Amino acid sequence: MLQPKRTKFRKVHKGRNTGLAHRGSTVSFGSIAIKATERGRMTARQIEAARRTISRRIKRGGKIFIRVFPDKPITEKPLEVRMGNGKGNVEYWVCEIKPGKILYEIEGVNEDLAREAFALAAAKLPFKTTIVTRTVM
Amino acid sequence: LKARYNDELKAKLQEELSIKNVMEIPRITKITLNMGVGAAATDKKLLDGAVADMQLIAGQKPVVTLARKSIAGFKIRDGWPIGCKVTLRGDQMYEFLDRLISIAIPRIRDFRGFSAKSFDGRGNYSMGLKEQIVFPEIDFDKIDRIRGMDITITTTARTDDEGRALMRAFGFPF
Amino acid sequence: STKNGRDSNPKMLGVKVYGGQTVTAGNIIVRQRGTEFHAGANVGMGRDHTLFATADGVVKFEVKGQFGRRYVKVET
Amino acid sequence: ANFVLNAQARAEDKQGKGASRRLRRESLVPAIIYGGNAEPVAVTLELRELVKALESNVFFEEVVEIKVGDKVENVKIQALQRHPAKNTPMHADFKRA
Amino acid sequence: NEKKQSRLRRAKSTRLHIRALGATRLCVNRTPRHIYAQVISADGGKVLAQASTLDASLRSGTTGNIEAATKVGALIAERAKAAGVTKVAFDRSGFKYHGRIKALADAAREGGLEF
RNA sequence: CGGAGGAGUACGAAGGUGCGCUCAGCGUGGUCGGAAAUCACGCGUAGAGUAUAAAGGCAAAAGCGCGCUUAACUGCGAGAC
RNA sequence: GCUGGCGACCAUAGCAAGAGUGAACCACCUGAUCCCUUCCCGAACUCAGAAGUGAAACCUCUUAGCGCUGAUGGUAGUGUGGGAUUACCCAUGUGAGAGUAAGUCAUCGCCAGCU
């Protein structure tokens, strides 16, 4: 369950998720990677579930690079509570995802095994993904 | 020293160290005496004795040194006096150097307390001496708790070799 | 019950006369909390860093000096 | 001489955001050619040919020929822009060599 | 060496204040061998009058003491009068107002410059 | 009844002026003495400070010292926000 | 052509490294008698002078090492009209930041000395 060790502020504005992921869309650490093709939110539990699935499939024979970190807190009201009376309490952490953002990379396994692991992990995610490989430019 | 240094050691060191210009010949600039008399706030008489000690060993008035920044681990406040220092230049530092080297070095019970090393890497040498005695001042009687000194001599010598040559020319044990 | 809910009254800072305008002596040019702009020729500085004109003329902004300070002056 | 890219001149009326989007809707790719002793020249490439060439690995370390009309330029690829989500090439840079 | 840098840092405030006031400046420079005194206009880029111990009349003397400074002050006052400046602001250029520079200033004041 | 902090003071110097001075950190050596007291030399560098919360500022330093002092004056006041 | 003072300008102008300069100028330099000075000290400030040296310092030259400047093209954003609602598309106008090619070891003014 990834989460920042400490934060400068506790609660943040909702914001709007727009635009494409020009940064963080290039394979840098491994040889094969999975990237999102539509935008959304990615929770820490989702990140952990996908990582566990990939590691279990590849039997820890390679290295998995996680390139998403959930540094955005999300609040909810305590339930049965009326509107107003201040902002709600922090409940979980998410990472904003834009189309093109790379989520996981794998180093040191066969392409077939890596693609099987990525197909297994894609079923755990709330958005559509695709598979990319390292290229010269 | 002064004149003796000028006549002998200038040319002697120039030939020894193969220095092309007389301006690069090592020279002694200043001598600094310091004591970090900590916890002086408790008694407030050890510092007063210390300034008298400095007036005795060096014929110069002492200047009391204040603490910079306040440390809770120690008991030093922001600006309380926690040390004493004097600075000697010109003929007076020569007098102090000659007087100390001649008479104080034999008087200490131990010997070879000062190495040929302990330069700061730039031709300046620091001394740590214990016991206010071994100087031309009254003995154990009529003096207060014994105190030690730090004696930092700063030279124009660029590195440790010209430092060592210059000070051995004066006659330091090592 | 929230522990927040306070704020101060507005202060209405900012540039009052822009470059190219004509001024009369005494006109306030810049209201500022600190010296975002510095006083050039024919411009005076008040106790609260307000910049005002000390002569009639045309206001001009510039960047000048070895620190790259912003200056505003009045040209007669 | 092994790699030859047939191109067309990309004029001022074909430069700009809207013109580039129209070109890419036509399945064409904008590119620029710059290098010592001559002014830059803007050209239009075919997406099909660009993808075919990029599939080869020796294309990134070999002198290639961009041919527009009768003019011929000997260049090496310098930079490429891809779509963040679709990986389609969108713009090319070519340094004279 | 920090000596000259400290001297310019000391002179900065007086020079900037004189420029802000807009008065004609009288600037002096001192070396162990010589003294110099030049009058500069308000904008600070033009020299109207000048005097020093490098002049043929004075170069044969000692040129590095109070006596030479007095004569240089008299010379600069005389030459500034011919140029046509009356009121000036003195600029000590970070030196202490004492000794040679004080003597030159007094010589100029007796010569007729009002400051 | 959105997210975060402060105030209901202090100071005859912590005000005025003339003159003067630069911080913080790290490394080398140096009695007690060290993680860190004071001394000396360097290295790189505004990261120090500004009575107090934050922001805008601060080399002519608005930061820091010393001597003399009361402009922490009276009557006003073109012109502006 | 060299040196000094005062400015314009504030890195394409700055740092770093390397090398040169003594006729004059400047700098170190002598010591401290009278001026003046250090919460100690002729270290700084100051005075009175030329026995030495251009060693240090300051200036001048060389180098793209660090730094700085920086296109063209494309991309993002965006005013107006229209079409859609994960925040896009079209017409029209506008147009970065980053990065790439490339550039840079400044350029002027007033006065005075020495050839």
Curated annotation (Swiss-Prot), chain A:
Keyword Ribosomal protein in record: yes
One of the record's GO cellular component terms: cytosolic large ribosomal subunit
InterPro entries named in the record: Ribosomal_uL16, Ribosomal_uL16_bact-type, Ribosomal_uL16_CS, Ribosomal_uL16_dom, Ribosomal_uL16_sf
SUPFAM superfamilies reported in the protein's UniProt record: Ribosomal protein L16p/L10e (SSF54686)
A Pfam entry, by short name: Ribosomal_L16
PROSITE patterns according to UniProt: RIBOSOMAL_L16_2
Molecular function, one GO term: rRNA binding
Organism domain of life: Bacteria
Keyword RNA-binding: yes
Gene Ontology biological process terms, A to Z: translation
Key words, A-Z: Ribonucleoprotein, Ribosomal protein, RNA-binding, rRNA-binding, tRNA-binding
Assembly mode: Part of the 50S ribosomal subunit.
Family: Belongs to the universal ribosomal protein uL16 family.
HAMAP family, per database record: Ribosomal_uL16
Functional description taken from the UniProt entry: Binds 23S rRNA and is also seen to make contacts with the A and possibly P site tRNAs.
Protein name as it appears in the record: Large ribosomal subunit protein uL16
Swiss-Prot record, chain B:
Alphabetically ordered keywords of this record: Ribonucleoprotein, Ribosomal protein, RNA-binding, rRNA-binding, tRNA-binding
GO molecular function terms listed in the Swiss-Prot or TrEMBL record: rRNA binding; structural constituent of ribosome; tRNA binding
Single biological process term from Gene Ontology: translation
Coiled-coil regions listed: none
GO (cellular component) term, any one: ribosome
Domain of life: Bacteria
Entry-linked InterPro entries: Ribosomal_uL5, Ribosomal_uL5_bac-type, Ribosomal_uL5_C, Ribosomal_uL5_CS, Ribosomal_uL5_dom_sf, Ribosomal_uL5_N
Stored SUPFAM superfamilies: RL5-like
Signal sequence region: none
Annotated Gene3D superfamilies: 3.30.1440.10
Xref: HAMAP family: Ribosomal_uL5_B (MF_01333_B)
Function summary: This is one of the proteins that bind and probably mediate the attachment of the 5S RNA into the large ribosomal subunit, where it forms part of the central protuberance. In the 70S ribosome it contacts protein S13 of the 30S subunit (bridge B1b), connecting the 2 subunits; this bridge is implicated in subunit movement. Contacts the P site tRNA; the 5S rRNA and some of its associated proteins might help stabilize positioning of ribosome-bound tRNAs.
Assembly description: Part of the 50S ribosomal subunit; part of the 5S rRNA/L5/L18/L25 subcomplex. Contacts the 5S rRNA and the P site tRNA. Forms a bridge to the 30S subunit in the 70S ribosome.
Protein family (similarity comment): Belongs to the universal ribosomal protein uL5 family.
Full protein name: Large ribosomal subunit protein uL5
Species for this entry: Acinetobacter baumannii (strain AB0057)
Gene name, Swiss-Prot/TrEMBL: rplE
From Swiss-Prot, chain D:
Region called Disordered, residue ranges: 1-22
GO CC entries: cytosolic large ribosomal subunit
Keywords: Ribonucleoprotein, Ribosomal protein, RNA-binding, rRNA-binding
InterPro entries in the cross-refs: Rbsml_bL25/Gln-tRNA_synth_N, Ribosomal_bL25/Gln-tRNA_synth, Ribosomal_bL25_short, Ribosomal_L25_dom, Ribosomal_uL5_bac-type
UniProt-listed CDD domains: Ribosomal_L25_TL5_CTC
GO biological process: translation
Annotated GO MF terms: 5S rRNA binding; structural constituent of ribosome
Function: This is one of the proteins that binds to the 5S RNA in the ribosome where it forms part of the central protuberance.
Entry similarity comment: Belongs to the bacterial ribosomal protein bL25 family.
Oligomeric and partner information: Part of the 50S ribosomal subunit; part of the 5S rRNA/L5/L18/L25 subcomplex. Contacts the 5S rRNA. Binds to the 5S rRNA independently of L5 and L18.
Protein name: Large ribosomal subunit protein bL25
From Swiss-Prot, chain E:
Keyword terms of this UniProt record: Ribonucleoprotein, Ribosomal protein, RNA-binding, rRNA-binding
InterPro entries named in the record: Ribosomal_uL18_bac-type, Ribosomal_uL18_bac/euk
Gene Ontology BP annotations: translation
Any single GO CC term annotated in Swiss-Prot or TrEMBL for this entry: cytosolic large ribosomal subunit
Subunit details: Part of the 50S ribosomal subunit; part of the 5S rRNA/L5/L18/L25 subcomplex. Contacts the 5S and 23S rRNAs.
Record-stated family: Belongs to the universal ribosomal protein uL18 family.
Protein name from the UniProt record: Large ribosomal subunit protein uL18
Naturally occurring in which organism (per UniProt): Acinetobacter baumannii (strain AB0057)
